[PDB]
Amino acid sequence: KEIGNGGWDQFQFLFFDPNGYLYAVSNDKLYKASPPQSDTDNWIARATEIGSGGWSGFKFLFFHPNGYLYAVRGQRFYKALPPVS
Amino acid sequence: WMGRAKEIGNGGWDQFQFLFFDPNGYLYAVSNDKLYKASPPQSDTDNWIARATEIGSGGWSGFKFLFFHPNGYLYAVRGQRFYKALPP
Amino acid sequence: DSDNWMGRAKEIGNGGWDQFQFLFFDPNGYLYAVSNDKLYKASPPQSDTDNWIARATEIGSGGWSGFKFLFFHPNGYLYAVRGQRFYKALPPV
Amino acid sequence: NWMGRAKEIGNGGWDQFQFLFFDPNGYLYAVSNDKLYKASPPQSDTDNWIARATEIGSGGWSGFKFLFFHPNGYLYAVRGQRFYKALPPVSNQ
Amino acid sequence: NWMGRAKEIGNGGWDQFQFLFFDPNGYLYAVSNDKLYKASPPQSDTDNWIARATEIGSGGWSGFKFLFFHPNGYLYAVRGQRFYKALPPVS
Amino acid sequence: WMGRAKEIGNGGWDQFQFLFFDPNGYLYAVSNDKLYKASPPQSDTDNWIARATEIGSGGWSGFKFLFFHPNGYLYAVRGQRFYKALPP
Amino acid sequence: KEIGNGGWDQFQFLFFDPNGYLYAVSNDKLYKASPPQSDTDNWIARATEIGSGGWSGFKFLFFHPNGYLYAVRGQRFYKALPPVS
Amino acid sequence: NWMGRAKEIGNGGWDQFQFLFFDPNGYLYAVSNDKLYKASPPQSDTDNWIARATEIGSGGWSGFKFLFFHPNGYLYAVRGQRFYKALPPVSNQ
Amino acid sequence: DSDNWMGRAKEIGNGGWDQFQFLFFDPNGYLYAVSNDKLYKASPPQSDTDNWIARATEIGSGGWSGFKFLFFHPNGYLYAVRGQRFYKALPPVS
Amino acid sequence: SDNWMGRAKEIGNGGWDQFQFLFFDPNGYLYAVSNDKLYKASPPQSDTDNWIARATEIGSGGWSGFKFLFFHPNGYLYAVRGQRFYKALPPV
Ligand SMILES: CC(=O)N[C@H]1C(=O)O[C@H](CO)[C@@H](O)[C@@H]1O
Numbered sequence: 001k002e003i004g005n006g007g008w009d010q011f012q013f014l015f016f017d018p019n020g021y022l023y024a025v026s027n028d029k030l031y032k033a034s035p036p037q038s039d040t041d042n043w044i045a046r047a048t049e050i051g052s053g054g055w056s057g058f059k060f061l062f063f064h065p066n067g068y069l070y071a072v073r074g075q076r077f078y079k080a081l082p083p084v085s
Numbered sequence: 086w087m088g089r090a091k092e093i094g095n096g097g098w099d100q101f102q103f104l105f106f107d108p109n110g111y112l113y114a115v116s117n118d119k120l121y122k123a124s125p126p127q128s129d130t131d132n133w134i135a136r137a138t139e140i141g142s143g144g145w146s147g148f149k150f151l152f153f154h155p156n157g158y159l160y161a162v163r164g165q166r167f168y169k170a171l172p173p
Numbered sequence: 174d175s176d177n178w179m180g181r182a183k184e185i186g187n188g189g190w191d192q193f194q195f196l197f198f199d200p201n202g203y204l205y206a207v208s209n210d211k212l213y214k215a216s217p218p219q220s221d222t223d224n225w226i227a228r229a230t231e232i233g234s235g236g237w238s239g240f241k242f243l244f245f246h247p248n249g250y251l252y253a254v255r256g257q258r259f260y261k262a263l264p265p266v
Numbered sequence: 267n268w269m270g271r272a273k274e275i276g277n278g279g280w281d282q283f284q285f286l287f288f289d290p291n292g293y294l295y296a297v298s299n300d301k302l303y304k305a306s307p308p309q310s311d312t313d314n315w316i317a318r319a320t321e322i323g324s325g326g327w328s329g330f331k332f333l334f335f336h337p338n339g340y341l342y343a344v345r346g347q348r349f350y351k352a353l354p355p356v357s358n359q
Numbered sequence: 360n361w362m363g364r365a366k367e368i369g370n371g372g373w374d375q376f377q378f379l380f381f382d383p384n385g386y387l388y389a390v391s392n393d394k395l396y397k398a399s400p401p402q403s404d405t406d407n408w409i410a411r412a413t414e415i416g417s418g419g420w421s422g423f424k425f426l427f428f429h430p431n432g433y434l435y436a437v438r439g440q441r442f443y444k445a446l447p448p449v450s
Numbered sequence: 451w452m453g454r455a456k457e458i459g460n461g462g463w464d465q466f467q468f469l470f471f472d473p474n475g476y477l478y479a480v481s482n483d484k485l486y487k488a489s490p491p492q493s494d495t496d497n498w499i500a501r502a503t504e505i506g507s508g509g510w511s512g513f514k515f516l517f518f519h520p521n522g523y524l525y526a527v528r529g530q531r532f533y534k535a536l537p538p
Numbered sequence: 539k540e541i542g543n544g545g546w547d548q549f550q551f552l553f554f555d556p557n558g559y560l561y562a563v564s565n566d567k568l569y570k571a572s573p574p575q576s577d578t579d580n581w582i583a584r585a586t587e588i589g590s591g592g593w594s595g596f597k598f599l600f601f602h603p604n605g606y607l608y609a610v611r612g613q614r615f616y617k618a619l620p621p622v623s
Numbered sequence: 624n625w626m627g628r629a630k631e632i633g634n635g636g637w638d639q640f641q642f643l644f645f646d647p648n649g650y651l652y653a654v655s656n657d658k659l660y661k662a663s664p665p666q667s668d669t670d671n672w673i674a675r676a677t678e679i680g681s682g683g684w685s686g687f688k689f690l691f692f693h694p695n696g697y698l699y700a701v702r703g704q705r706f707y708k709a710l711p712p713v714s715n716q
Numbered sequence: 717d718s719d720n721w722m723g724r725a726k727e728i729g730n731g732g733w734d735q736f737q738f739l740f741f742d743p744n745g746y747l748y749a750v751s752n753d754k755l756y757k758a759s760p761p762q763s764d765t766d767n768w769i770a771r772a773t774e775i776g777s778g779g780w781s782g783f784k785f786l787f788f789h790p791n792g793y794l795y796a797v798r799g800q801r802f803y804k805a806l807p808p809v810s
Numbered sequence: 811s812d813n814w815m816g817r818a819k820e821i822g823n824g825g826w827d828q829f830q831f832l833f834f835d836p837n838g839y840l841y842a843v844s845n846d847k848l849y850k851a852s853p854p855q856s857d858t859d860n861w862i863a864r865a866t867e868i869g870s871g872g873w874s875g876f877k878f879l880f881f882h883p884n885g886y887l888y889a890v891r892g893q894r895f896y897k898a899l900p901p902v
Pocket residue numbers: 093094095096097098128129130131132133134135259
């Protein structure tokens with residue numbers, strides 16, 4: 001989470017930036033601030049894991065602009081589509 | 086403008102209470118007290134609503150605003166309180 | 174509480190913001206507004222004295238009040254609902 | 267010779283980063299002291315880059331072995347045994 | 360497993376590289392014993408990449424901490440504490 | 451060189467996004483999404499920005515280049531596009 | 539305003555001559571040409587008007603290296619600072 | 624004395640001009656057929672001045688009654704009832 | 717406001733001033749003038765009691781009103797168009 | 811834009827990316843800042859003019875250090891260092 005308690009239903013619009021700034025129209029005026037009572041984000045906890053086991057053993061791992069995933073392990077060199085899930 | 090635009094559904098689109106995107110481009114819709122999620126339709130033969138996945142089974146009609154923070158967190162105004170969490 | 178949030182926020186606009194049919198962002202941070210059946214685009218105001226509505230370009234000619242939903246996909250596509258019809262394209266220009 | 271004809275775009279501190287790479291739009295991304303930073307590349311030695319970067323990650327960014335962009339704008343990351351992907355974050359909140 | 364179900368495109372020498380990366384058009388760039396090579400990526404183990412690569416960089420290549428392409432084709436680099444950009448070299 | 455030089459301001463001067471002259475010698479400055487205009491300052495006691503005239507009110511911080519043609523027109527590059535007009 | 543469409547931000551430098559030629563650095567090369575989509579200049583439309591009646595009535599009107607404005611109007615001779623606005 | 628000891632710095636076409644005067648730097652200014660021309664004075668009969676002059680003004684220069692320089696390098700002009708000043712133009716643009 | 721400007725200027729001359737075919741300064745501020753076929757030079761006047769034409773040296777005897785243009789370069793050289801021809805030289809001197 | 815360049819005159823052909831500043835004084839002299847040095851010389855008129863070779867070094871060190879460096883129409887050089895603003899005739 002409860003992040004505010006009074007008047008929240010009173011805005012005419014209430015919506016975010018692409019950078020997460022909260023915007024609000026109230027009483028014909030317009031406001032910008034970060035939302036009330038935010039938490040630290042932690043991206044990894046919300047990300048899709050797509051592989052599990054040995055991923056840090058690659059000496060390089062990087063994409064071609066065509067979207068294939070290139071990789072070096074030991075002496076060898078691999079391309080496939082990225083893994084998915 | 087509607088001239089050059091793909092039509093991507095026909096019935097029902099006006100009976101949604103909210104209708105909007107998460108940062109990933111999945112589509113969200115509230116109807117009949119429920120919250121639905123599926124990727125947007127690309128044309129009229131996609132019974133979007135028939136495939137959507139009911140991520141919220143009741144309670145979703147009370148909302149004054151229902152929308153996404155760009156980090157993926159879902160925000161909600163009910164009555165006069167303001168709420169946030171990851172989507173269910 | 175909303176009033177003290179509003180207390181510590183920045184007042185970046187001061188009149189004429191109630192009257193828009195729609196007010197939302199594309200993914201590149203431009204602000205769109207529908208008013209008097211028209212569509213408008215421009216940088217958000219950074220302060221009280223920015224006459225945002227004078228400043229803004231009319232990308233959209235008429236009809237715009239007639240959309241039930243009008244909102245942006247993250248890939249920059251404009252999605253709109255009219256009557257019971259769902260549509261999609263790049264934004265007007 | 268490349269170095270002699272190169273434009274110098276920053277005069278100190280570049281050594282501190284553990285990753286430094288572009289997304290497909292050419293925003294420059296950086297990990298420093300376990301934090302994640304984003305902004306348009308700098309352009310002269312007086313472009314203080316770190317002081318105008320957005321700190322979009324507050325902690326844990328130094329545990330990754332790889333951190334890099336798919337052309338589709340998704341960020342991929344390897345931590346320990348695991349491989350992950352997600353849109354990059356936009357705020358540390 | 361991913362490795363299993365993937366194409367092998369190279370078979371030896373691949374860790375001799377200090378840098379190994381793409382430009383926006385898909386040429387493979389590589390640093391190795393202080394030099395910079397460039398050629399279109401390999402396709403199978405039968406392909407001898409370093410034998411068909413152009414040396415485009417003569418010396419000093421391994422002094423960089425970072426070395427990577429901007430989508431617009433400008434090549435960026437950190438050496439020591441300083442930062443640089445410019446069109447890649449070309450032979 | 452800063453040996454022989456006149457110091458004509460002491461704060462905020464870095465922090466302008468652009469900083470330049472028209473052909474007549476007025477100084478122009480972009481900061482906080484605004485365009486300011488006033489004759490240059492001749493000393494520290496001159497609060498340039500407090501006197502500058504805000505000849506543009508919002509929209510100014512988008513620009514990759516902002517500069518005068520020597521006949522008095524103001525050229526500007528926003529994103530991909532290139533512009534000119536007499537100054538506001 | 540519009541005078542240019544794709545690419546205008548590619549350049550490293552983009553600035554004028556004293557004579558109005560536009561210079562440009564792109565991809566490590568320097569170009570000079572007239573800017574695109576120029577208009578005829580018309581100086582009188584942009585000049586500062588400093589006076590408003592009977593100015594053409596003078597037989598002579600000309601400056602001393604002083605900056606004093608000298609003027610003859612039928613048989614009499616005058617000097618003063620030029621007018622201002 | 625004067626005509627006999629004078630240097631001849633040009634030999635036809637001088638009659639066409641409606642104004643002809645110096646700016647404080649000593650560049651030569653001329654109006655002819657409603658156009659404004661500017662270049663360093665010529666120096667001999669073979670110095671074809673008008674073929675190397677920049678056409679800095681391309682119309683309405685004939686409607687002026689006076690056109691002259693302040694020592695500070697501003698161009699003053701009288702046209703009809705009105706009086707004006709500005710830096711001289713530098714191109715017909 | 718041509719009258720407005722005049723009203724507020726020093727009146728520095730009273731009559732005769734309209735007989736001048738040319739009337740201009742050199743780089744140092746000497747005033748030159750042509751009437752009849754003659755060139756006069758002196759320091760400019762500063763009130764109507766100053767009889768300028770009476771203190772000016774005649775520095776040019778005849779031919780002065782044959783010019784279309786007669787004017788000083790900043791470096792002190794004197795330029796003239798006569799007919800279709802153009803000339804420069806140090807001004808004459810008496 | 812690509813075709814603006816196509817009809818422009820190419821008057822320089824390598825090494826122009828590296829400057830920190832590249833601007834004109836009111837008399838038409840070109841100034842460039844490179845490797846912490848200020849250079850001055852009339853602009854090339856063609857590809858084969860090795861501009862950086864002929865240019866006179868007129869400022870010996872410090873030149874990369876200004877955030878702005880630019881000319882007033884009356885010929886004065888204005889510069890910004892850190893939080894501070896300056897002006898003087900250019901060096902020589
Ligand atoms: C809201 C919704 O899901 N609408 C779709 C639906 O019901 O099936 C139709 C075809 O059967 C589509 O054209 C509709 O747009």
